[PDB]
Amino acid sequence: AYPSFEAYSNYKVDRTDLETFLDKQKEVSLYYLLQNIAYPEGQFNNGVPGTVIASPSTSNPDYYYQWTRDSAITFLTVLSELEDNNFNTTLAKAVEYYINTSYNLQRTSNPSGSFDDENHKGLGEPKFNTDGSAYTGAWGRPQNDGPALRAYAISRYLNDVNSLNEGKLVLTDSGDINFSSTEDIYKNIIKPDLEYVIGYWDSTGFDLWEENQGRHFFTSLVQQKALAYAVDIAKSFDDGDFANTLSSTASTLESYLSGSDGGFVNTDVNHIVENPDLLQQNSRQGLDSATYIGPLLTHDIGESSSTPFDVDNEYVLQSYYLLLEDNKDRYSVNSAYSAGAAIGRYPEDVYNGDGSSEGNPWFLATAYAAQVPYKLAYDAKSASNDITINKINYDFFNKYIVDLSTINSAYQSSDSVTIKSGSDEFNTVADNLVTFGDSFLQVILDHINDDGSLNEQLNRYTGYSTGAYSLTWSSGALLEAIRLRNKVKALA
Ligand SMILES: C[C@H]1O[C@H](O[C@H]2[C@H](O)[C@@H](O)[C@@H](O[C@H]3[C@H](O)[C@@H](O)[C@H](O)O[C@@H]3CO)O[C@@H]2CO)[C@H](O)[C@@H](O)[C@@H]1N[C@H]1C=C(CO)[C@@H](O)[C@H](O)[C@H]1O
Ligand SMILES: C[C@H]1O[C@H](O[C@H]2[C@H](O)[C@@H](O)[C@@H](O[C@H]3[C@H](O)[C@@H](O)[C@H](O)O[C@@H]3CO)O[C@@H]2CO)[C@H](O)[C@@H](O)[C@@H]1N[C@H]1C=C(CO)[C@@H](O)[C@H](O)[C@H]1O
Ligand code: NA
Numbered sequence: 005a006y007p008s009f010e011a012y013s014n015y016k017v018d019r020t021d022l023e024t025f026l027d028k029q030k031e032v033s034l035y036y037l038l039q040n041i042a043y044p045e046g047q048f049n050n051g052v053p054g055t056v057i058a059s060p061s062t063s064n065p066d067y068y069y070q071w072t073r074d075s076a077i078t079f080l081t082v083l084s085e086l087e088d089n090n091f092n093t094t095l096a097k098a099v100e101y102y103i104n105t106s107y108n109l110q111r112t113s114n115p116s117g118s119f120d121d122e123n124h125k126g127l128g129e130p131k132f133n134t135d136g137s138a139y140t141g142a143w144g145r146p147q148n149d150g151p152a153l154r155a156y157a158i159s160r161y162l163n164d165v166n167s168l169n170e171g172k173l174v175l176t177d178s179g180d181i182n183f184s185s186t187e188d189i190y191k192n193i194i195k196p197d198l199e200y201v202i203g204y205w206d207s208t209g210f211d212l213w214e215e216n217q218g219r220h221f222f223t224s225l226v227q228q229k230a231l232a233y234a235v236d237i238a239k240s241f242d243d244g245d246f247a248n249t250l251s252s253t254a255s256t257l258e259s260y261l262s263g264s265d266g267g268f269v270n271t272d273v274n275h276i277v278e279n280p281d282l283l284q285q286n287s288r289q290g291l292d293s294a295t296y297i298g299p300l301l302t303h304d305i306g307e308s309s310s311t312p313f314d315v316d317n318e319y320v321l322q323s324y325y326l327l328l329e330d331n332k333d334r335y336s337v338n339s340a341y342s343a344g345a346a347i348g349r350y351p352e353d354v355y356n357g358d359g360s361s362e363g364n365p366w367f368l369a370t371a372y373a374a375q376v377p378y379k380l381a382y383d384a385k386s387a388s389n390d391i392t393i394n395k396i397n398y399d400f401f402n403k404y405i406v407d408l409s410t411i412n413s414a415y416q417s418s419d420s421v422t423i424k425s426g427s428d429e430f431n432t433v434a435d436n437l438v439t440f441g442d443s444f445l446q447v448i449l450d451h452i453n454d455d456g457s458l459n460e461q462l463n464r465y466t467g468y469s470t471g472a473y474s475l476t477w478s479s480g481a482l483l484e485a486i487r488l489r490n491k492v493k494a495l496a
């Protein structure tokens with residue numbers, strides 16, 4: 005049940021009309037995303053401002069909590085909207101309430117620890133109650149992705165304040181508020197998260213799915229991003245030695261991610277092994293949608309981020325392809341899909357959304373799967389960069405994107421194919437990438453609730469939605485897929 009949920013229902017979903025669907029969901033999913041964020045000017049005006057619920061579901065399952073990860077990812081979408089709107093005050097107030105509530109959560113002692121522990125050990129805590137209190141039940145803690153994603157989101161807000169609002173914050177005359185300046189946000193909210201990442205990146209915690217302990221590609225990747233992105237922020241506040249500490253630590257994490265210490269790049273199977281310790285344990289073979297979700301989050305389309313493992317990385321792209329192939333056989337709901345399909349978390353998954361039996365495809369993983377080919381095309385076209393296709397990825401391209409032999413008949417004799425910007429071959433591949441991306445959004449259209457809200461999961465047999473209702477992260481993932489689709493299609 006989800007008693008606080010309010011439906012929009014401002015249109016009848018037509019499952020035969022993708023273009024119209026995506027036009028309407030650009031607004032409907034934003035409505036549902038914002039509904040789960042507490043702010044005085046919003047629908048959720050009775051919660052502590054800055055609290056993001058993962059879902060209005062309070063039973064079967066009970067997701068009425070604030071997770072550091074979901075809240076940060078939610079705010080990355082809010083920030084994308086804020087940026088597209090040339091800095092909307094309403095949204096900026098929501099971001100600042102979230103920054104303030106994050107300040108309070110950071111200082112809340114919990115089962116992972118406290119703020120005054122070494123490098124703020126308490127910041128590893130995955131979730132809190134909506135009233136701001138510590139969640140004291142058993143849980144897969146700590147999770148070291150949260151502080152990284154939050155540091156990144158709040159850093160990005162500061163860059164936006166400086167670039168789009170002439171350095172001006174919007175809530176600094178409110179009583180509730182634990183900052184008076186951008187420097188206060190950096191020193192007292194961003195920097196503690198960065199100190200946590202510096203202190204704990206190479207320690208044991210749970211993955212983003214809250215289930216396994218050890219090395220995790222997504223976690224290390226979002227940590228590397230937060231550190232790299234904060235370098236210039238630190239420099240801007242005359243925090244130069246710390247800026248260089250961030251730079252060196254980011255470089256160290258980049259080497260970790262790319263080498264045999266991390267264990268993520270696996271040249272036996274030529275794809276990323278998301279959780280290398282589980283490969284060692286023989287419990288999972290390493291395919292995971294987090295492998296491509298992370299790259300998407302750490303290379304936001306405005307930024308031209310140079311951080312490692314963008315979606316063009318051959319190992320990331322092969323994990324994507326192989327998970328797609330797996331899931332097209334595993335889930336009966338996918339049996340008639342010729343192109344994209346409903347994608348889950350990992351092939352070994354047993355979480356059904358409210359217990360254990362068999363795992364399902366997830367709306368968020370499916371929406372992120374659309375973004376992969378959209379971003380390949382966008383990156384190339386927007387920068388006039390070549391598309392380079394490594395031999396590891398020839399099967400993927402030949403199955404879904406292009407007959408490579410029509411590009412270069414001798415492709416099998418080369419380690420790669422490079423397709424020059426502006427060529428007919430390039431336009432063919434870019435266009436075919438977008439068509440392929442669209443097929444994943446069609447899967448969403450096939451199975452979305454009539455009210456336009458997205459659950460956590462869709463049943464692997466029937467495609468009916470299941471698990472947590474109107475999941476904020478589902479809404480965000482779809483919103484970012486639509487934003488990317490529109491941006492790539494708008495390119496001349
Ligand atoms: C919400 C979450 O749920 C499932 O995992 C939970 C359990 O439901 C929960 O009982 C608790 O499990 C412990 C258990 O009760 C106890 O017997 C034992 O000693 O140890 C357990 C903790 O290790 O904790 C876990 C979470 O650690 C799933 O397995 C999860 O995948 C699931 N995560 C979802 C939900 C959200 C919120 O939107 C996302 O942030 C997240 O990425 C997601 O995968
Ligand atoms: C309008 C409706 O559409 C969506 O439902 C889909 C499925 O997602 C989809 O997989 C497909 O279902 C078939 C399925 O593959 C298989 O199990 C079985 O063989 O038969 C199905 C084909 O007859 O087809 C339907 C579309 O007909 C959504 O998933 C739904 O949420 C949606 N609305 C339903 C659901 C509800 C409440 O859950 C009602 O409020 C409503 O009246 C109804 O239309
Ligand atoms: Na104040």
Ligand code: NA
Binds near residue numbers: 303308314
């Ligand atoms: Na890139």
